[PDB]
Amino acid sequence: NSVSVDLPGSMKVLVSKSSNADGKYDLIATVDALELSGTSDKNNGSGVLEGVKADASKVKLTISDDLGQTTLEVFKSDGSTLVSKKVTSKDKSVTFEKFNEKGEVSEKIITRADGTRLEYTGIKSDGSGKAKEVLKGYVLEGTLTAEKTTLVVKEGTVTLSKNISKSGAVSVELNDTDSSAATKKTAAWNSGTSTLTITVNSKKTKDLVFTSSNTITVQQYDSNGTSLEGSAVEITKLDEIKNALK
């Protein structure tokens, strides 16, 4: 009788074919063996369903009115304090949070639509913590504060810092403690093209592009230091990034 509705977050909800005397629709779903049920004033599969884990934790699935977003929450057995929350947004990106006993977020894992991830762990009450960015083929590691995420790669005396601000803006900087003017790397950041240009001995040597696809590419300049040569190469492993910093 009911109608199966496909949901963000690899879930399904069954909605009754017709409404009850109050005009409301019955909803049922099964999420990892847990039976959830609810009632809704819409007919499309949107609304709230509830159930319990085997350990008595409360579970709530909230489906937005237009089916674009789902939120799967686990609470303590009294339903008061959050334990975890998984939000699948309409781009199919996912935010997964764990909470401590005061309902404060202690872990946040963001999975972008392309599968790359930001992993924030050991989050404290000031919003500081440890940070990792999980890319295709490699991981970047660093820290989180309420101002920015800073991911760091070191090679020789060079430190490359990729910053993701609280607003999401990317900026990259390079600092080299080599004081020899012949070998010291410096770099300039172009926000318009998300490109870091490295210079050595007053000549541009390479462009590192931090793409909207969450990749990094590297392209060398000619010996003239003015024209790019060849074509940009996508970084596939951490060892590659280090090579570009030599």
Side-chain angles (χ1 to χ4, degrees), residues 122-185:
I123 304 170
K124 303 306 172 187
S125 71
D126 65 352
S128 70
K130 303 304 152 293
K132 289 194 184 78
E133 190 175 23
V134 179
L135 295 319
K136 192 179 178 301
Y138 56 98
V139 307
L140 305 177
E141 291 174 320
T143 57
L144 165 76
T145 73
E147 298 190 353
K148 65 184 179 303
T149 299
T150 299
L151 308 155
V152 177
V153 180
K154 291 174 170 295
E155 163 66 30
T157 45
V158 174
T159 297
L160 181 72
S161 301
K162 176 182 174 186
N163 300 301
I164 310 174
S165 86
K166 55 175 169 188
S167 66
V170 177
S171 65
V172 181
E173 56 194 293
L174 182 151
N175 295 285
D176 188 356
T177 59
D178 194 351
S179 66
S180 164
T183 48
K184 178 195 198 82
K185 272 65 92 175

Side-chain angles (χ1 to χ4, degrees), residues 19-243:
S19 70
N20 69 21
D22 304 321
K24 301 192 177 182
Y25 284 80
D26 296 317
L27 304 171
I28 58 195
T30 311
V31 179
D32 190 27
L34 301 185
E35 301 295 328
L36 312 182
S37 66
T39 68
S40 174
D41 59 13
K42 289 187 67 61
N43 77 333
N44 65 339
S46 72
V48 170
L49 302 83
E50 292 173 276
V52 294
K53 293 192 76 183
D55 70 4
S57 307
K58 306 296 203 188
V59 179
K60 184 178 283 179
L61 169 62
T62 302
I63 302 149
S64 67
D65 286 354
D66 64 1
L67 312 175
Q69 175 178 91
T70 59
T71 299
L72 182 69
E73 288 165 318
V74 181
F75 297 82
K76 294 296 184 187
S77 66
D78 59 10
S80 55
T81 311
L82 267 174
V83 168
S84 62
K85 177 169 158 183
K86 177 173 90 144
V87 177
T88 306
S89 296
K90 72 181 183 181
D91 64 347
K92 314 305 182 292
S93 69
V94 177
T95 298
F96 177 76
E97 293 168 300
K98 300 172 179 164
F99 303 84
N100 68 13
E101 301 157 280
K102 295 282 161 243
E104 297 166 346
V105 61
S106 56
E107 176 187 294
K108 180 194 288 189
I109 311 299
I110 302 164
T111 303
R112 304 190 181 103
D114 67 3
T116 65
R117 307 200 298 276
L118 285 165
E119 297 183 342
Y120 298 111
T121 59
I123 304 170
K124 303 306 172 187
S125 71
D126 65 352
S128 70
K130 303 304 152 293
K132 289 194 184 78
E133 190 175 23
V134 179
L135 295 319
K136 192 179 178 301
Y138 56 98
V139 307
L140 305 177
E141 291 174 320
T143 57
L144 165 76
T145 73
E147 298 190 353
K148 65 184 179 303
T149 299
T150 299
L151 308 155
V152 177
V153 180
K154 291 174 170 295
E155 163 66 30
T157 45
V158 174
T159 297
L160 181 72
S161 301
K162 176 182 174 186
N163 300 301
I164 310 174
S165 86
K166 55 175 169 188
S167 66
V170 177
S171 65
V172 181
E173 56 194 293
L174 182 151
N175 295 285
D176 188 356
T177 59
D178 194 351
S179 66
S180 164
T183 48
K184 178 195 198 82
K185 272 65 92 175
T186 58
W189 175 248
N190 185 346
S191 65
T193 59
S194 294
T195 297
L196 186 82
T197 297
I198 305 180
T199 287
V200 176
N201 191 23
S202 302
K203 281 176 291 294
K204 296 178 182 180
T205 57
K206 56 198 70 176
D207 272 2
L208 282 168
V209 183
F210 295 74
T211 75
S212 59
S213 298
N214 306 118
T215 65
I216 301 168
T217 70
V218 59
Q219 194 178 354
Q220 321 295 311
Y221 283 79
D222 185 81
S223 47
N224 64 13
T226 60
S227 58
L228 289 165
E229 71 178 16
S231 51
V233 174
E234 182 182 278
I235 297 276
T236 75
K237 56 189 106 158
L238 193 55
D239 202 62
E240 251 142 45
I241 305 181
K242 294 186 170 256
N243 288 346

